[PDB]
């Protein structure tokens, strides 16, 4: 199922992943797309940060779901 991840800048990145594809898979897809580390990316959905342990299915993310991507890293 295709989806749409909104970048912190506002650009909508179109991708395709299965409900079984864990967040870690989605993140990796984003990196290969724009060119940024996934571990730093943050998938926000339903006002809840998607944990790498979870998966699209858990977030009932259907084809066309709008995922809010945000930056997240240590140091501060």
From Swiss-Prot:
It holds the Pfam family ubiquitin. GO terms for cellular component: cytoplasm; cytosol; extracellular exosome; glutamatergic synapse; nucleoplasm; nucleus; postsynapse. Residues 70-72 are annotated as: Interaction with UBE1C. It is found in: Nucleus. The modification (Microbial infection) Deamidated glutamine is found at residue 40. Cleavage of precursor form by UCHL3 or SENP8 is necessary for function. (Microbial infection) Deamidated at Gln-40 by bacterial cyclomodulin Cif produced by enteropathogenic E.coli, Y.pseudotuberculosis or B.pseudomallei, leading to impair NEDD8 ability to activate cullin-RING-based E3 ubiquitin-protein ligase complexes (CRL complexes). Deamidation occurs on NEDD8-modified cullins. NEDD8 deamidation prevents switching from the inactive to active state by maintaining the 'closed' structure of the CRL complexes. Deamidation may also impair its deconjugation by the COP9 signalosome; However this result needs additional evidences. Changing residue 72 to R: Prevents adenylation by UBE1C. Ubiquitin-like protein which plays an important role in cell cycle control and embryogenesis via its conjugation to a limited number of cellular proteins, such as cullins or p53/TP53. Attachment of NEDD8 to cullins is critical for the recruitment of E2 to the cullin-RING-based E3 ubiquitin-protein ligase complex, thus facilitating polyubiquitination and proteasomal degradation of cyclins and other regulatory proteins. Attachment of NEDD8 to p53/TP53 inhibits p53/TP53 transcriptional activity. This is Ubiquitin-like protein NEDD8. It comes from Homo sapiens (Human).
